[PDB]
Amino acid sequence: GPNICTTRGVSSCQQCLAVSPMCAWCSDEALPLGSPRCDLKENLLKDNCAPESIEFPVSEARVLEDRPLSDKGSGDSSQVTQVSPQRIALRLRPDDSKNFSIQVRQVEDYPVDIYYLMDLSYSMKDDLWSIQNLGTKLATQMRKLTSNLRIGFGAFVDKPVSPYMYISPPEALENPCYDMKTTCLPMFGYKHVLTLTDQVTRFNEEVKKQSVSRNRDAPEGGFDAIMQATVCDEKIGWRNDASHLLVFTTDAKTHIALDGRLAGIVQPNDGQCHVGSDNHYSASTTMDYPSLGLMTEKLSQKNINLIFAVTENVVNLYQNYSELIPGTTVGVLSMDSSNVLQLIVDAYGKIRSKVELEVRDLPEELSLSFNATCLNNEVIPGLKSCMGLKIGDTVSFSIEAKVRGCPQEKEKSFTIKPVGFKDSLIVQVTFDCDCACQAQAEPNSHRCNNGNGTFECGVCR
Amino acid sequence: EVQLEESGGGLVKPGGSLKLSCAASGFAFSSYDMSWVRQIPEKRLEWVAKVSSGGGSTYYLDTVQGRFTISRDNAKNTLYLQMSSLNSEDTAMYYCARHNYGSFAYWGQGTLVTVSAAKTTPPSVYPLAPGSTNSMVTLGCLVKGYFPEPVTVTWNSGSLSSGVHTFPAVLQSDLYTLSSSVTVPSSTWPSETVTCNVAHPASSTKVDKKIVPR
Amino acid sequence: LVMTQTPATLSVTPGDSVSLSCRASQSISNHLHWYQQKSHESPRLLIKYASQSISGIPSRFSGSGSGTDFTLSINSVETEDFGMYFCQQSNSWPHTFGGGTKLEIKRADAAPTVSIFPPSSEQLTSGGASVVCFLNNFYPKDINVKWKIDGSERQNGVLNSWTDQDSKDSTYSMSSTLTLTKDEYERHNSYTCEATHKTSSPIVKSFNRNE
Amino acid sequence: FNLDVDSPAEYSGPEGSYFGFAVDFFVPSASSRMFLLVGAPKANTTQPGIVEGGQVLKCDWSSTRRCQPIEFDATGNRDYAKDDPLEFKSHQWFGASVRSKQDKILACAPLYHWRTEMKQEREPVGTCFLQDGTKTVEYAPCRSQDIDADGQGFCQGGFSIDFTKADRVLLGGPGSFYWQGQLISDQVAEIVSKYDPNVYSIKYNNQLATRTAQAIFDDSYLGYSVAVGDFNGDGIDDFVSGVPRAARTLGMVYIYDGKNMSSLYNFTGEQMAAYFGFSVAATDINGDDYADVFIGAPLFMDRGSDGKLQEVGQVSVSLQRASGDFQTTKLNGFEVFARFGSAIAPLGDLDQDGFNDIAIAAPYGGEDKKGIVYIFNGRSTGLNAVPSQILEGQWAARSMPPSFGYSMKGATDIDKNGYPDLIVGAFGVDRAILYRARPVITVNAGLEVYPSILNQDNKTCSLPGTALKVSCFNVRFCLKADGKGVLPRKLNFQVELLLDKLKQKGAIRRALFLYSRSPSHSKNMTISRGGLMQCEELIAYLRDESEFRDKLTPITIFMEYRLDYRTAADTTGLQPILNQFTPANISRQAHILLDCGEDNVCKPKLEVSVDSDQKKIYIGDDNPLTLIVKAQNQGEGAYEAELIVSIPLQADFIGVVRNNEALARLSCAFKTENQTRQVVCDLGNPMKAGTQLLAGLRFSVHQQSEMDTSVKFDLQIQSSNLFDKVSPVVSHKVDLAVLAAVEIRGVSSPDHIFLPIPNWEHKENPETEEDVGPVVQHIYELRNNGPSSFSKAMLHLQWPYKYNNNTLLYILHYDIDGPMNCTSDMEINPLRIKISSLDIHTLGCGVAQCLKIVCQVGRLDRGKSAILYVKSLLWTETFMNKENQNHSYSLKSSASFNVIEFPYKNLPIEDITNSTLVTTNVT
Numbered sequence A: 001g002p003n004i005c006t007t008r009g010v011s012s013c014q015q016c017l018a019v020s021p022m023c024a025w026c027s028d029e030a031l032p033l034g035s036p037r038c039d040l041k042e043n044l045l046k047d048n049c050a051p052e053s054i055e056f057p058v059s060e061a062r063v064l065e066d067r068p069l070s071d072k073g074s075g076d077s078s079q080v081t082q083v084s085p086q087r088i089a090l091r092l093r094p095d096d097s098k099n100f101s102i103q104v105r106q107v108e109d110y111p112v113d114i115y116y117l118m119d120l121s122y123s124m125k126d127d128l129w130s131i132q133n134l135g136t137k138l139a140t141q142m143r144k145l146t147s148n149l150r151i152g153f154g155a156f157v158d159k160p161v162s163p164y165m166y167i168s169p170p171e172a173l174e175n176p177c178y179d180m181k182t183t184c185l186p187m188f189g190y191k192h193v194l195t196l197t198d199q200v201t202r203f204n205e206e207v208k209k210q211s212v213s214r215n216r217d218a219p220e221g222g223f224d225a226i227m228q229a230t231v232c233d234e235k236i237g238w239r240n241d242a243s244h245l246l247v248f249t250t251d252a253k254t255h256i257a258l259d260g261r262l263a264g265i266v267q268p269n270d271g272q273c274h275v276g277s278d279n280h281y282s283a284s285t286t287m288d289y290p291s292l293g294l295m296t297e298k299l300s301q302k303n304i305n306l307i308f309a310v311t312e313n314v315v316n317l318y319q320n321y322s323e324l325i326p327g328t329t330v331g332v333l334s335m336d337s338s339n340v341l342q343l344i345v346d347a348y349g350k351i352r353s354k355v356e357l358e359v360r361d362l363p364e365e366l367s368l369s370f371n372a373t374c375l376n377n378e379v380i381p382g383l384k385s386c387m388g389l390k391i392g393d394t395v396s397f398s399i400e401a402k403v404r405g406c407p408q409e410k411e412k413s414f415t416i417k418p419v420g421f422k423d424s425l426i427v428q429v430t431f432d433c434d435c436a437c438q439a440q441a442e443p444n445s446h447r448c449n450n451g452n453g454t455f456e457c458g459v460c461r
Numbered sequence B: 001e002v003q004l005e006e007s008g009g010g011l012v013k014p015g016g017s018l019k020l021s022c023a024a025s026g027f028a029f030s031s032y033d034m035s036w037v038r039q040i041p042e043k044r045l046e047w048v049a050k051v052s053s054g055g056g057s058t059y060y061l062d063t064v065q066g067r068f069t070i071s072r073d074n075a076k077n078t079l080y081l082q083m084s085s086l087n088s089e090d091t092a093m094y095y096c097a098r099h100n101y102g103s104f105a106y107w108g109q110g111t112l113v114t115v116s117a118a119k120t121t122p123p124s125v126y127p128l129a130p131g132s133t134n135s136m137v138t139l140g141c142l143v144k145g146y147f148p149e150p151v152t153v154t155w156n157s158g159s160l161s162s163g164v165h166t167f168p169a170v171l172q173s174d175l176y177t178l179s180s181s182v183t184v185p186s187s188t189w190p191s192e193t194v195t196c197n198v199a200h201p202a203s204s205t206k207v208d209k210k211i212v213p214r
Numbered sequence C: 001l002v003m004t005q006t007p008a009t010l011s012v013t014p015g016d017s018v019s020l021s022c023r024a025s026q027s028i029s030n031h032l033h034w035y036q037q038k039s040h041e042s043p044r045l046l047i048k049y050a051s052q053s054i055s056g057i058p059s060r061f062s063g064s065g066s067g068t069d070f071t072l073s074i075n076s077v078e079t080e081d082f083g084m085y086f087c088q089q090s091n092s093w094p095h096t097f098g099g100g101t102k103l104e105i106k107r108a109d110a111a112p113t114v115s116i117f118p119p120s121s122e123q124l125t126s127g128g129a130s131v132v133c134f135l136n137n138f139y140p141k142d143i144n145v146k147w148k149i150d151g152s153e154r155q156n157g158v159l160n161s162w163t164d165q166d167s168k169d170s171t172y173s174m175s176s177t178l179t180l181t182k183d184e185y186e187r188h189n190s191y192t193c194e195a196t197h198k199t200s201s202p203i204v205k206s207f208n209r210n211e
Numbered sequence D: 001f002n003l004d005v006d007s008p009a010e011y012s013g014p015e016g017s018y019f020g021f022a023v024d025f026f027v028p029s030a031s032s033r034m035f036l037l038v039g040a041p042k043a044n045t046t047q048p049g050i051v052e053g054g055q056v057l058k059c060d061w062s063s064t065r066r067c068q069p070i071e072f073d074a075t076g077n078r079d080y081a082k083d084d085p086l087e088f089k090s091h092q093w094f095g096a097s098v099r100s101k102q103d104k105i106l107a108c109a110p111l112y113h114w115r116t117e118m119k120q121e122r123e124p125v126g127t128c129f130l131q132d133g134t135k136t137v138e139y140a141p142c143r144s145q146d147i148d149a150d151g152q153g154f155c156q157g158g159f160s161i162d163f164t165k166a167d168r169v170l171l172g173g174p175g176s177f178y179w180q181g182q183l184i185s186d187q188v189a190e191i192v193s194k195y196d197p198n199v200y201s202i203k204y205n206n207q208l209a210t211r212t213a214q215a216i217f218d219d220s221y222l223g224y225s226v227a228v229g230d231f232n233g234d235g236i237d238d239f240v241s242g243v244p245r246a247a248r249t250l251g252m253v254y255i256y257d258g259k260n261m262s263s264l265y266n267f268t269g270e271q272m273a274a275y276f277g278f279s280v281a282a283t284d285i286n287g288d289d290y291a292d293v294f295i296g297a298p299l300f301m302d303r304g305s306d307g308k309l310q311e312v313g314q315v316s317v318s319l320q321r322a323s324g325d326f327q328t329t330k331l332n333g334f335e336v337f338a339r340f341g342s343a344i345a346p347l348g349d350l351d352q353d354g355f356n357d358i359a360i361a362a363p364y365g366g367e368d369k370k371g372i373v374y375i376f377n378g379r380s381t382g383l384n385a386v387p388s389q390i391l392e393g394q395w396a397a398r399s400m401p402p403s404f405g406y407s408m409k410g411a412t413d414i415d416k417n418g419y420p421d422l423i424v425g426a427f428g429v430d431r432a433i434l435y436r437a438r439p440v441i442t443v444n445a446g447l448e449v450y451p452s453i454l455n456q457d458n459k460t461c462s463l464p465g466t467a468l469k470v471s472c473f474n475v476r477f478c479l480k481a482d483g484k485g486v487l488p489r490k491l492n493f494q495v496e497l498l499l500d501k502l503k504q505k506g507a508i509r510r511a512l513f514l515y516s517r518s519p520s521h522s523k524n525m526t527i528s529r530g531g532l533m534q535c536e537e538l539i540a541y542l543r544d545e546s547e548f549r550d551k552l553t554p555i556t557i558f559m560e561y562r563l564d565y566r567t568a569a570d571t572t573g574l575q576p577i578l579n580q581f582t583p584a585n586i587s588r589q590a591h592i593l594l595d596c597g598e599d600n601v602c603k604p605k606l607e608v609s610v611d612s613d614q615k616k617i618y619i620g621d622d623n624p625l626t627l628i629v630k631a632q633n634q635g636e637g638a639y640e641a642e643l644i645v646s647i648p649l650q651a652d653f654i655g656v657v658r659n660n661e662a663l664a665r666l667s668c669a670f671k672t673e674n675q676t677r678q679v680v681c682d683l684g685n686p687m688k689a690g691t692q693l694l695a696g697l698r699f700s701v702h703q704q705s706e707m708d709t710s711v712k713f714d715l716q717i718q719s720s721n722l723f724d725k726v727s728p729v730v731s732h733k734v735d736l737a738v739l740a741a742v743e744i745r746g747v748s749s750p751d752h753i754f755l756p757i758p759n760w761e762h763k764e765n766p767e768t769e770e771d772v773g774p775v776v777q778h779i780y781e782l783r784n785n786g787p788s789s790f791s792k793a794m795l796h797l798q799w800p801y802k803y804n805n806n807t808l809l810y811i812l813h814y815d816i817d818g819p820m821n822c823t824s825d826m827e828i829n830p831l832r833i834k835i836s837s838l839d840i841h842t843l844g845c846g847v848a849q850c851l852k853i854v855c856q857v858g859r860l861d862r863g864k865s866a867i868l869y870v871k872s873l874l875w876t877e878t879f880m881n882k883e884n885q886n887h888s889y890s891l892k893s894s895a896s897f898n899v900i901e902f903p904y905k906n907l908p909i910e911d912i913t914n915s916t917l918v919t920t921n922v923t
Helices: A015-019 A041-049 A122-133 A136-142 A201-208 A222-231 A259-263 A292-301 A312-323 A340-351 C121-125 D188-193
Strands: A060-065 A087-092 A097-105 A112-119 A149-158 A189-197 A243-250 A304-311 A329-333 A354-360 A366-375 A378-381 A385-387 A394-403 A412-418 A425-431 A445-447 A449-453 B003-007 B018-025 B034-039 B045-051 B058-060 B069-073 B078-083 B092-100 B103-107 B111-115 B124-128 B136-146 B152-155 B164-166 B170-172 B175-185 B195-200 B205-210 C003-006 C009-012 C018-024 C032-037 C044-048 C061-066 C069-074 C083-089 C101-105 C113-117 C128-138 C144-149 C152-154 C158-162 C172-181 C190-196 C203-208 D009-012 D023-026 D035-040 D055-060 D067-069 D097-101 D104-109 D113-116 D119-123 D127-132 D135-139 D160-163 D168-172 D183-187 D225-229 D238-243 D252-257 D260-268 D279-283 D292-297 D301-303 D309-311 D314-319 D327-332 D343-348 D357-362 D372-375 D389-392 D408-410 D422-426 D431-435 D440-449 D459-462 D469-482 D490-499 D511-513 D520-528 D534-542 D555-563 D585-592 D606-612 D616-618 D623-633 D642-646 D651-656 D668-671 D678-682 D693-701 D710-718 D730-737 D742-748 D775-784 D792-803 D809-816 D820-824 D849-857 D865-874 D889-901 D912-922
Touching (some): A087 A097, A087 A394, A097 A354, A112 A122, A112 A136, A112 A189, A122 A201, A136 A149, A136 A340, A149 A201, A149 A222, A189 A201, A222 A292, A292 A304, A292 D309, A304 A340, A312 A329, B003 B092, B018 B034, B045 B078, B045 B092, B103 C032, B124 B195, B124 B205, B124 C121, B136 B195, B136 C113, B136 C128, B152 B175, B175 C128, B175 C158, B175 C172, C018 C032, C018 C083, C032 C061, C069 C083, C113 C190, C144 C172, D009 D035, D023 D097, D035 D097, D035 D104, D035 D431, D055 D104, D097 D160, D127 D188, D183 D188, D183 D238, D225 D292, D238 D279, D260 D292, D357 D408, D372 D422, D440 D490, D469 D490, D469 D520, D520 D534, D534 D555, D606 D710, D606 D730, D623 D710, D742 D889, D742 D912, D775 D889, D792 D809, D820 D865, D849 D865, D865 D889
Parallel strands (some): A087 A425, A112 A149, D225 D279, D343 D408, D616 D730
Antiparallel strands (some): A060 A087, A149 A189, A354 A412, A366 A378, A366 A394, A412 A425, A445 A449, B034 B045, B092 B111, B124 B136, B136 B175, B164 B175, B195 B205, C003 C018, C032 C044, C032 C083, C083 C101, C128 C172, C158 C172, C190 C203, D009 D431, D023 D035, D055 D067, D097 D104, D104 D127, D168 D183, D238 D252, D252 D260, D279 D292, D301 D309, D314 D327, D469 D534, D490 D520, D490 D555, D511 D534, D555 D585, D623 D693, D668 D678, D710 D730, D742 D775, D820 D849, D889 D912
């Protein structure tokens, strides 16, 4: 009979849900202050409360949709599926939790978001021409890696300030190359042109539309461009549900933090997005270059891999920078950039050893605790990720969904997605603290046997 | 001090060719870009061609390109412009100029190029004397029928400079006509001789014409 | 690219201030230079790069503007500021110049000195006859010169030439030549030069072939 | 550690000008008044047509915080055409770098641009403005016919600056020769004397400059940072030039001979983009008169415990040796992005301890990244890498953070005291702060005792209030007030002397001082100049041997020191502080000779004997037992004296008795160790010869089981002494005995019976109670009062029955309980009383024939009641006499007993016997 909420929940219509999942509360005078109250579902059920007046939510873990995980990326028609659960129903009561799991496979098919960030220095005018066949061809080869790939584009020409830019000593350098019987563009720091799109044929056209500018100072502004491409998710077109490959294409050594002193640039770089409505980095004349530290933190935190498509003569600096920018990779670029297609396909294959989850739109009242199965049946707590996987391997994450207190009676959608992958788990969460018992109350003085009080949730008060 | 001097202009028959040159001194010629700008009879300036300081890059006006060549000899400190297939549109005063990053900081004096089927003709010079009394008397000379320009007129071989007005030539049917006046004290004419001195370099002709009373 | 330059002409009294305006069909950033050209002399750079003066150019000359619209202001115009002004574009090939502005100096009006000359015996010998009229030291430049033969207006054969404004006195001179065939010349008696101008009632000078 | 952050002199200028980019201090021979210099690169000023030209402002540190511009110029751009800059003073960052010496201030504008008459090209040459007294000179060797990037056009002279000993100017120009860089150096005197304002290309005869290098060094930036020092042995100071992108972006620092621009030394960074060369500074850190070079590398990436790359900033320390073979250590920031290598600058001798030192800036550190400056002392072997103190920004970012320490200068004694301050810039807040240093005093204190070994019989000191003499000792206290720089000649030191520190905390005070008659004394000591180790002497009193039993425990004497402040501070309130590595707790231990014979060897004679207060323990209950144990010391004294007794667990030790003043109060523990049971008393660790300690050890002896005839306690006293550690054992036994008094009780339920019972009549053969008579229940009981239980006893009852031939009491039933069994000789209930539902006067057993009933009684626990109830009826025929009326009767039964057997088989056993009479009065 008497079980926990017999003394802890009888005074309250809501507290009884908060105290224990096994308790129930009759209504409509089924047991009108009969003797037992709350107890366990079964005790009231037997003592005349069998009808659904008991209002007995319990914490629940159910799966709404579970389309099976796929073996091959070529398995078209039914959508190739990268994760096992698709939609989950979660019902919590106050100060409780339920377990679920996320199975993720490195199918030969997770989606790719690739951004082509180009060096727009004069020596690259022939590369912009060669690149007119990319986008279409890049994606075509990548179709064998995944069926879903998007391509964007941007560029860098270094900070448009006195010592890097030809200083506008004359007017002649406000629209340069007047020196050599040609014309070219002014310096602009970092520019964004094309957001990622599945209509990759747009890249072919967008690169054709571009042309180079002039730089006095040989070092490139590539580190501002990388950091902004890495950080500005909202314009670059990064879908969390896709791998982020930032391709940095260049023929020269980069400019680094505190070198900016020569232009009077001493403002620390906070690693923030400064790209405005003109798709231009407005901070290009006031903020210094990001450090290797800032690049590492932002690309790691936001799951961006950098690919350095760098010509042979400056590889030594890029490889050494990569050693201090962990998670990145450096290849060797042809002077006509015709090998970017292969450079990227290979770079992607080299990158592919990680699975990591991110939960979007999580409310402040709910805590998601993870235990990641990285090997065999061993789980490491505190991880949203596993390293050292090969294509075709799986990872299994054990997740505990706990609610603190009694959050408002609204359904929330928690999206649990691998970073890198289209597929995600939608966990639909509601809170069983507020239920029919609260509405089903008519105090009215009398009804508490012979007396004057209230009555609610099967018990007088 | 920068010094630029153009030469080699003259009368060219249509479809012909002509080489202009411009000597330079007073500066590091090989350190500056050079260009030619021409002044069209409407007094409009038109840029014609530019050659970079090392001679590597040469840019031409679209309606010039394929006919003209701009080049330079940095050892001889001399700029050249080789014209060919010349049309009437190419008649102009040609000026050499030194650049300062898109500006033409220093200019030469100008060499005149005339493109025309007309033949070189010396001027016929006539005195202008008053018909058969004041403190001053106006005298002159009519310089008629010459081609091409220029013609230079002085009075008493440059001795008389005051009271002198030389009018710009008027082109009528492929020949130019100009006049020149001189005002002198009435008390010195005919007591002193007044002579009009006319030079026409194109035909190596110089005529001295005395003005006598009618 | 097209460079439009206005006003085409400008008449300014000494001590007054003026401005010139340069319009580009597209943006030329600050790639705009200004030049001055005096009579029988070559152009000289006044202002470079829209506002930077040069070395011995007076402060009175001040350039301004960017992109599509530039000006050249001249404060307290001096007699010596007479002459043509040109803007020039250095942004895109070919380089281009504006039409140019002719700056004139305004001064007190002055009637012309008019003198008429008969054909020389030397010209008549060759079969021609040019009657010449000089109109010196006048201001404003606008004069109307007519020829009358035995009282009848003649246009055929009349050639006019104006000098550029004098650098000392800021006045103008003009020469009007009436060219006839000797045989035609000998059919008329009276040759008259008529000058209609402000400051007066035309000024007339004449020559009688029978005198 | 002596730099406060409580009352700094806070300098600031107009918002947005970036006051704080460069700082310096100006000390002209002209006066006693010194000024701080703070550069402000984006400052607007008077100069017509010039915006964001920058300015350097001079500030009087003595209150009067207003900063004012140095009048290096007032005019607009030098002209050529009218209103055409021949030099562009706008957007040039003047104040970005500032330096001075004596009466000359040289401020830099690294973005100063020139026009060269040769070509219309603006070039970032970078220049300085020299303020010589009231004369102004343009310093710009960087401006020459070498008009562009190939040449000197891009020098950007002004990112770094210094001066050599005497008067050479060091102007770094990092953009020279396609950013290879260049260090420009000239005598300031030539610059002033040979200057011609109509020439902007003045060459100097003593001009030195780094030569153009191979393309190998493109983009290296020599001139980003510069310092000076005696690197190539003696003679003129050399030039320390930072070149941050040399060595493939790792960075290098080159030291050039001050007399000739040819490299002497080459140092390099370990990590890419660390920017080794951001801050180059030099100082003689070891106090051995040779400058070392400390290179800041602010972007340095360190490795954490998890292998993570942490941007902390590094300061690479190259320590100079005579051979030119530099030794090295590394300092690193603690926090991420707290770019520690941003600035290194001289602090000079922060404690005036003979060592020159520096402070390190980490401008972007701290929660709320205001910037942290790390202060520490130099050492003969390097730097003290761990900060003793930090300075921190007190201002929030307006936009960008202040970057505290971005720029820094020090090793200048601004105030009266010769303890150098730190001028720390905060350009992001338009501020600079002067953090003042307190004097640092190293105090060498010493405490000595002459008769360090005491003898209690040497009663030579007079106690001031008595006719009695005292055994005593001389305690001496000395002080050395060492300090350099300017500190008051006389320092005030407060000293307290504490005697017997380890006993004052609850124990007997072993020693006091003779005059104060207390364990303490104090005085305010005036110590002047340093080295003048003056002293005071106190004489201590060893307490009387008749009360204090302690002989071995040392007497400790402690000195406690405080340096005062108001009374040792100057007129600006700049109080001294003692050196952070100097203790203020100094002590000496004295001891007393513990007897130990003429040969100084302790030879105790330990003996123990006991007196039993109680001789017997009774079996079956908790018997208190107190034994008085006498601990003797008939030889020399002893070390760590204790009483040890081995006690059976059955004897529960309570403690040492404190209810008898004739006994010592000994602390006492109870423990079990290594299969033992022990009681241990504290006899006083430092024991003296002749001590007699008697104490009562109280136990509760349970022993309820069939145990041995006595309880034995094994006692010894012992020590940790060199000789004769343990006394002989005294074996003490206490007899165990059986005590089992048993009380025999009983009662007749009614005490009396009245003969005229209603409806009581005679029958020939009576049935049921009504025809027999009243029922009387006779209760007999054996109660165990004594503590010892027993196994067997008998309860013997004599029931009077036949008086003459009259049968009086017929037993209905024997109601027995407990371990009891009754046997009768005579028939019980011969009358067949089926009732249930429950010598004339004295009818005793010696009168009426009685029935013999014997009850065997089995094992009974102490406190148990063994009961026999005899329910019987009074038969009418034998009370209603026929012969002659009737008589009052006393019906008397007798219950006797004998306890025979106890489980305590090995103990003395006495039979326990007694008897009780139980009667009813029948009337």
